[PDB]
Amino acid sequence: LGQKLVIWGTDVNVAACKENFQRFLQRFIDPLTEPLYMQRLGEINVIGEPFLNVNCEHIKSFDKNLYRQLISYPQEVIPTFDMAVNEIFFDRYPDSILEHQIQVRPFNALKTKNMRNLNPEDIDQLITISGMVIRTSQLIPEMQEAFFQCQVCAHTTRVEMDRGRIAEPSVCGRCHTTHSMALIHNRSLFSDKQMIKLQESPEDMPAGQTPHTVILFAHNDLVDKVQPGDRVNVTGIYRAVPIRVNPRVSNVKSVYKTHIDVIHYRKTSEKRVELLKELSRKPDIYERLASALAPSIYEHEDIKKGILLQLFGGTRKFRAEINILLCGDPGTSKSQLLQYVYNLVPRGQYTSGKGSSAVGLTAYVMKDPETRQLVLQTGALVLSDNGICCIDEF
Amino acid sequence: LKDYALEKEKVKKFLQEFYQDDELGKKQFKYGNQLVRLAHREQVALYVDLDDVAEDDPELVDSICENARRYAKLFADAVQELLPQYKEREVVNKDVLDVYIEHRLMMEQPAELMRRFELYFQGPSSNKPRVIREVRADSVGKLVTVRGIVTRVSEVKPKMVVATYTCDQCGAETYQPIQSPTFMPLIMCPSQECQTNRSGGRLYLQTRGSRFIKFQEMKMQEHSDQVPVGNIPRSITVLVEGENTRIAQPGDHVSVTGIFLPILRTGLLSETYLEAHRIVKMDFYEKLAASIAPEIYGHEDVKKALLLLLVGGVDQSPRGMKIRGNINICLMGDPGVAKSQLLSYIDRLAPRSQYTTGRGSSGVGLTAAVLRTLEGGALVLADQGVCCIDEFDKMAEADRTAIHEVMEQQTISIAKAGILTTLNARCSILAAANPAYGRYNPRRSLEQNIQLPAALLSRFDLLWLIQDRPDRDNDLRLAQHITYVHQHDMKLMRRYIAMCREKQPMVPESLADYITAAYVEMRREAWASTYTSARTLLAILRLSTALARLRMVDVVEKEDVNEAIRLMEMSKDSLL
DNA sequence: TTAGAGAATTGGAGAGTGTGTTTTTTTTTTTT
DNA sequence: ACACACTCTCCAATTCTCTAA
Ligand SMILES: [Zn+2]
Ligand SMILES: [Zn+2]
């Protein structure tokens, strides 16, 4: 009887908690018409995505008690909210078909903690932090349900597995012969995981110091959504784990290693055609489009026209595209002009003829810093195929 | 050996009865008051002072100084036994870990799990600090005091103190206190019901119940002047734990009280470390212009240029069309000229600054570097301040590109392990350079004399040639001063620049029109007499706004533009 | 007809034994 | 000091056989 369940180490009732979340779904209209998340529930029923975002500020403004319980015990509360959503989703629209149970992703709008101020008091609480991505691993497969088959008589059995431990059979129940059951790797059931590395952003640093870093693990749906160098806000569970002294021995060290278990992260038409047709039918459109380029430059109109013509180009034997050269004194605005036009075209590239440049004009082969296997690095000229390549100090 | 029960009662007597003639002689019994605060969970750590103990029992102090670890445990138990007597109040529930303890009490109705306080010794004033070389093996286990410089510090990590497990079958709980640097966890339930029935229930560890403490690792090194002739300096590892964390910083002088102990294995020779118990760290315009480098005769307006370099302009920041406020200047010196004195005076004067030389010496470079974490770099260590480069003309292409990147973006990049890490460099730059051969030649341009490339060399707001030559009276005056020196308020200045730099003065359209007329006339003369460009206009803006900041005024005025104009104009005269 | 006691065979719970475990000097080709 | 692989032992569970309830 579900009403008897209470979370360990504390005194919170599970069934009451589920009911309170359902009341929130059935009541929270947008304070700025059915409830806001009920709109998304109606939409996701037809769109077919497997997840539902909820903003924590709506939970807090609806009820302080539920909010406190969520932040305190995310490991037990979040699966309860998952169950609540799925009950409503299938109580309504029962004929709809969906391959998976819906996930709920609570998220907090803004950073609550500096990654320099995380303390032992925070362990297993829901926190949110911000930073700059540095590196992303290859995708890692992960076991979910082991498949065992008897060597002697081909009988099969399946084992649901327990926080990383497999309950290996000792004897085949059909043929009563010990140590005869074998794990079949490619018949087992697997999941996806990825490891991401993140750094504090340069603005919030103490003066003259080097930056700190953390390790994030992302599962299933979220497993490939970010790339190096960009910046994000992340919400997750702050975990802590022991580590072994050597691969053979079973002793563990007395100082633990911590990581973030990711739950949510955020990055920081006929009407147009008719407008374009009317604008193109306007007189002196060539002058107007040229004039639109680089407003910081007040007089070089025919140069702007030449650049505009390069952006438009010919059409397809013979080379159909256009090449342009700018010459004169250093310190003139030409580099700014290159950087301006570089930012206007999707397949654009920018580099310098100097050896200090960030990416070379020449293709080359090197060893991967991760695997130390060979990788072919094509140059800027190749990457800008069917695009514009800006070159400085030519 | 002593009876530690008698010693416990003596310690209790000290805590119960000692008063330092405390609270302005009102005799309020400092440690009794502290025990009240501890009982009501107002405070965590308690620093017992051994000078107080010495008033009653110096033999106890001597007993503590050797084999300190016993007395650490003894005092902690005494405080735990006395704590309920100073309680009078019920404390509010405020911690998940204590919610588990509260549930444990509710279900029940070891002490290490409940003992939420820390106890540390403050060293007796008799004990002078040792150098890291004088802590020899006869001091193992004894209380010591050491002095040195910090080199490296880790982040704060959670250290395990007692583990808590739960049993799947019988519903009980078990505890395991931790003391060594490693341990081995439990597996299967030892309770009598599970054991007698051999039911095989397994144990699951609970991070919601177990106890953790803040832990941090640090290294400390000898002062260079304390090292004996012809030797390499040594270092010592210091372990910081509890309420002592986050005090120390890299490159900072500290004095540490602690216990010196050997490391546990997993030969008879073993490494050692220092267990920390306490860490202890070791008009206006003309007047301020005349206050810069008074040892040096002449160079009146150069001193004002350096003053405005320290004061700075304003970052305009119009919606990304950025103009930066940092002044940057360069000094060209004849061989052996007085510039070294002026440079070192500004280096000494400035509240946050750094120095380096362009030859690329055996030490760390202008940018950050890697060792086996990232560290260092003159461009990095000067951040909210000014950085000075000496013998700039001997720089390499790496140095030139680094300076170019700082001038554009005021940030740098160094690869730790192929990753593209990047790092703040927000400071202003001051450059000192010398001609390629001999004295500067007025018959040739400055590019021909100093021979840096014109692209970066023209970045500086001001350029000054420091040329000087013999004369009988001036040389005699200088010689008299030097021989006199050999024979025999900065706080106000810092406060003035602190308060005045709060201003960000704007310009009205009338001043913009005035500047337009002045600038076009100046450029007409420049081509008629070329070097003038947009950089010149931004330099005028920077120096005039900087002067407006030097005044306690919210806007620039005509006199500021005129002052900036005569300063940039007259700088050419130094080249001739 | 249903159930317990005395004798013989066999499984496995348990113990014991053996073994494994960045940072400096010098050459060679080709770039300058 | 702390884990595999192998060898070996003694205790008592399972069945046969004779007997009483
Ligand atoms: Zn089988
Ligand atoms: Zn048990």
XYZ file of N, CA, C and O in Angstrom, chain B residues 441-519:
316
model
N 70.218 58.608 -32.895
C 70.652 59.504 -33.963
C 69.481 60.381 -34.417
O 68.534 59.853 -35.021
N 69.490 61.704 -34.177
C 68.381 62.549 -34.673
C 68.237 62.598 -36.189
O 67.168 62.994 -36.672
N 69.265 62.230 -36.954
C 69.161 62.242 -38.412
C 68.324 61.087 -38.968
O 68.137 61.034 -40.190
N 67.822 60.176 -38.124
C 67.067 59.005 -38.552
C 65.809 58.849 -37.703
O 65.749 59.311 -36.560
N 64.798 58.197 -38.282
C 63.513 58.013 -37.617
C 63.651 57.086 -36.410
O 64.638 56.359 -36.259
N 62.638 57.117 -35.536
C 62.674 56.263 -34.351
C 62.574 54.788 -34.731
O 63.111 53.926 -34.029
N 61.877 54.475 -35.829
C 61.835 53.091 -36.298
C 63.220 52.606 -36.714
O 63.571 51.444 -36.489
N 64.017 53.476 -37.335
C 65.372 53.090 -37.724
C 66.287 52.962 -36.507
O 67.233 52.166 -36.518
N 66.025 53.741 -35.454
C 66.866 53.706 -34.258
C 66.543 52.502 -33.373
O 67.438 51.731 -33.007
N 65.272 52.332 -33.004
C 64.872 51.319 -32.022
C 64.539 49.983 -32.695
O 64.766 48.920 -32.114
N 63.968 50.018 -33.904
C 63.805 48.851 -34.787
C 62.798 47.813 -34.277
O 62.957 46.619 -34.546
N 61.732 48.247 -33.554
C 60.519 47.437 -33.434
C 59.608 47.693 -34.642
O 59.692 48.754 -35.268
N 58.730 46.749 -35.006
C 57.831 46.999 -36.144
C 56.808 48.090 -35.842
O 56.268 48.176 -34.737
N 56.546 48.919 -36.858
C 55.726 50.118 -36.682
C 54.291 49.795 -36.272
O 53.634 50.618 -35.622
N 53.772 48.631 -36.680
C 52.375 48.284 -36.417
C 52.058 48.282 -34.923
O 51.087 48.908 -34.482
N 52.875 47.583 -34.125
C 52.655 47.542 -32.680
C 53.323 48.717 -31.969
O 52.840 49.161 -30.921
N 54.440 49.220 -32.508
C 55.161 50.314 -31.857
C 54.313 51.584 -31.775
O 54.462 52.374 -30.836
N 53.426 51.802 -32.748
C 52.552 52.973 -32.748
C 51.306 52.806 -31.875
O 50.454 53.701 -31.874
N 51.169 51.691 -31.148
C 50.015 51.513 -30.265
C 50.046 52.489 -29.094
O 48.993 52.942 -28.627
N 51.240 52.782 -28.580
C 51.393 53.579 -27.366
C 50.798 54.978 -27.522
O 50.963 55.633 -28.556
N 50.096 55.430 -26.476
C 49.503 56.765 -26.488
C 50.573 57.850 -26.561
O 50.381 58.873 -27.229
N 51.697 57.656 -25.859
C 52.804 58.608 -25.831
C 54.133 57.888 -26.029
O 54.318 56.759 -25.562
N 55.047 58.557 -26.735
C 56.416 58.102 -26.962
C 57.368 59.210 -26.522
O 57.187 60.368 -26.914
N 58.373 58.864 -25.706
C 59.334 59.829 -25.167
C 60.755 59.305 -25.342
O 61.050 58.175 -24.939
N 61.638 60.131 -25.917
C 63.064 59.814 -26.014
C 63.788 60.415 -24.813
O 63.822 61.639 -24.644
N 64.376 59.544 -23.997
C 65.100 59.960 -22.781
C 66.566 60.088 -23.183
O 67.360 59.147 -23.101
N 66.937 61.291 -23.632
C 68.298 61.620 -24.058
C 68.951 62.571 -23.056
O 68.315 63.521 -22.590
N 70.220 62.309 -22.722
C 70.953 63.118 -21.749
C 72.451 63.041 -22.047
O 72.920 62.089 -22.678
N 73.202 64.043 -21.579
C 74.614 64.184 -21.924
C 75.347 64.923 -20.804
O 74.708 65.551 -19.952
N 76.695 64.865 -20.776
C 77.446 65.479 -19.663
C 77.289 66.992 -19.544
O 77.086 67.703 -20.530
N 77.404 67.475 -18.304
C 77.607 68.889 -18.006
C 78.208 68.989 -16.608
O 77.876 68.184 -15.735
N 79.087 69.979 -16.402
C 79.902 70.022 -15.186
C 79.046 70.169 -13.929
O 79.200 69.399 -12.973
N 78.131 71.143 -13.909
C 77.355 71.367 -12.689
C 76.365 70.235 -12.436
O 76.222 69.783 -11.297
N 75.674 69.758 -13.474
C 74.710 68.678 -13.269
C 75.403 67.375 -12.880
O 74.925 66.654 -11.995
N 76.532 67.058 -13.519
C 77.279 65.866 -13.129
C 77.821 65.997 -11.711
O 77.832 65.020 -10.955
N 78.281 67.192 -11.331
C 78.763 67.393 -9.968
C 77.633 67.239 -8.955
O 77.823 66.650 -7.888
N 76.454 67.790 -9.262
C 75.295 67.633 -8.386
C 74.925 66.162 -8.223
O 74.680 65.686 -7.105
N 74.879 65.429 -9.338
C 74.567 64.002 -9.292
C 75.600 63.239 -8.470
O 75.250 62.378 -7.653
N 76.885 63.523 -8.698
C 77.948 62.846 -7.965
C 77.876 63.162 -6.477
O 78.087 62.281 -5.635
N 77.597 64.423 -6.134
C 77.434 64.805 -4.736
C 76.293 64.029 -4.093
O 76.427 63.526 -2.973
N 75.165 63.902 -4.798
C 74.032 63.152 -4.259
C 74.378 61.676 -4.059
O 74.094 61.100 -3.001
N 74.969 61.041 -5.078
C 75.303 59.615 -4.992
C 76.308 59.363 -3.866
O 76.146 58.435 -3.061
N 77.361 60.187 -3.784
C 78.356 59.996 -2.727
C 77.769 60.290 -1.347
O 78.131 59.627 -0.370
N 76.880 61.287 -1.239
C 76.203 61.553 0.029
C 75.380 60.346 0.466
O 75.414 59.947 1.637
N 74.616 59.767 -0.465
C 73.802 58.589 -0.158
C 74.692 57.431 0.286
O 74.353 56.692 1.219
N 75.839 57.250 -0.375
C 76.728 56.150 -0.002
C 77.463 56.413 1.317
O 77.835 55.459 2.012
N 77.693 57.682 1.675
C 78.422 58.015 2.902
C 77.541 57.932 4.149
O 78.015 57.504 5.208
N 76.274 58.345 4.050
C 75.376 58.439 5.212
C 74.277 57.379 5.189
O 74.436 56.299 5.759
N 53.437 61.475 1.062
C 52.899 60.252 1.728
C 52.200 59.355 0.705
O 51.194 59.742 0.111
N 52.748 58.149 0.513
C 52.185 57.214 -0.459
C 50.764 56.801 -0.091
O 49.949 56.524 -0.976
N 50.458 56.714 1.209
C 49.104 56.351 1.626
C 48.090 57.381 1.141
O 47.021 57.022 0.630
N 48.424 58.668 1.268
C 47.538 59.720 0.779
C 47.385 59.660 -0.737
O 46.286 59.862 -1.260
N 48.480 59.414 -1.461
C 48.404 59.323 -2.920
C 47.519 58.157 -3.349
O 46.692 58.282 -4.265
N 47.691 57.005 -2.697
C 46.881 55.834 -3.008
C 45.407 56.094 -2.705
O 44.529 55.729 -3.494
N 45.118 56.759 -1.581
C 43.730 57.090 -1.264
C 43.150 58.098 -2.255
O 41.966 58.010 -2.614
N 43.959 59.061 -2.711
C 43.482 60.022 -3.703
C 43.109 59.317 -5.002
O 42.027 59.551 -5.553
N 43.994 58.454 -5.517
C 43.648 57.756 -6.757
C 42.496 56.780 -6.527
O 41.738 56.478 -7.455
N 42.343 56.268 -5.302
C 41.215 55.390 -5.012
C 39.891 56.141 -5.114
O 38.946 55.665 -5.756
N 39.800 57.320 -4.491
C 38.529 58.044 -4.493
C 38.248 58.716 -5.839
O 37.094 58.752 -6.279
N 39.275 59.254 -6.507
C 39.032 60.025 -7.726
C 38.712 59.128 -8.923
O 37.985 59.546 -9.831
N 39.238 57.898 -8.951
C 38.977 56.996 -10.075
C 37.550 56.443 -10.096
O 37.220 55.680 -11.011
N 36.705 56.793 -9.121
C 35.290 56.443 -9.176
C 34.546 57.185 -10.287
O 33.481 56.726 -10.713
N 35.080 58.311 -10.759
C 34.426 59.131 -11.770
C 34.567 58.525 -13.165
O 35.576 57.894 -13.492
N 33.534 58.728 -13.991
C 33.538 58.349 -15.409
C 33.005 59.531 -16.219
O 31.858 59.511 -16.688
N 33.814 60.582 -16.405
C 33.292 61.830 -16.994
C 32.964 61.700 -18.478
O 33.745 61.149 -19.257
N 31.805 62.238 -18.863
C 31.358 62.300 -20.249
C 31.862 63.581 -20.920
O 32.521 64.419 -20.298
N 31.556 63.710 -22.210
C 31.854 64.899 -23.000
C 30.537 65.428 -23.561
O 29.704 64.630 -23.996
N 30.267 66.738 -23.529
C 29.109 67.270 -24.259
C 29.430 67.516 -25.729
O 30.588 67.501 -26.152
N 28.366 67.744 -26.510
C 28.525 67.914 -27.956
C 29.372 69.137 -28.296
O 30.052 69.155 -29.329
N 29.326 70.178 -27.459
C 30.175 71.347 -27.683
C 31.650 70.965 -27.629
O 32.450 71.390 -28.471
N 32.024 70.144 -26.644
C 33.406 69.685 -26.550
C 33.767 68.773 -27.715
O 34.906 68.791 -28.190
N 32.821 67.952 -28.178
C 33.080 67.106 -29.341
C 33.343 67.948 -30.587
O 34.251 67.651 -31.369
N 32.551 69.002 -30.788
C 32.772 69.916 -31.910
C 34.126 70.615 -31.794
O 34.864 70.750 -32.784
N 34.455 71.084 -30.587
C 35.751 71.711 -30.333
C 36.898 70.756 -30.653
O 37.881 71.134 -31.303
N 36.778 69.506 -30.198
C 37.789 68.487 -30.465
C 37.879 68.206 -31.960
O 38.965 67.951 -32.483
N 36.742 68.211 -32.662
C 36.748 67.998 -34.109
C 37.570 69.073 -34.812
O 38.437 68.771 -35.646
N 37.298 70.340 -34.487
C 38.041 71.444 -35.089
C 39.529 71.353 -34.758
O 40.390 71.469 -35.647
N 39.845 71.123 -33.479
C 41.236 71.017 -33.047
C 41.948 69.864 -33.750
O 43.082 70.015 -34.219
N 41.289 68.706 -33.837
C 41.896 67.530 -34.452
C 42.152 67.736 -35.942
O 43.223 67.367 -36.439
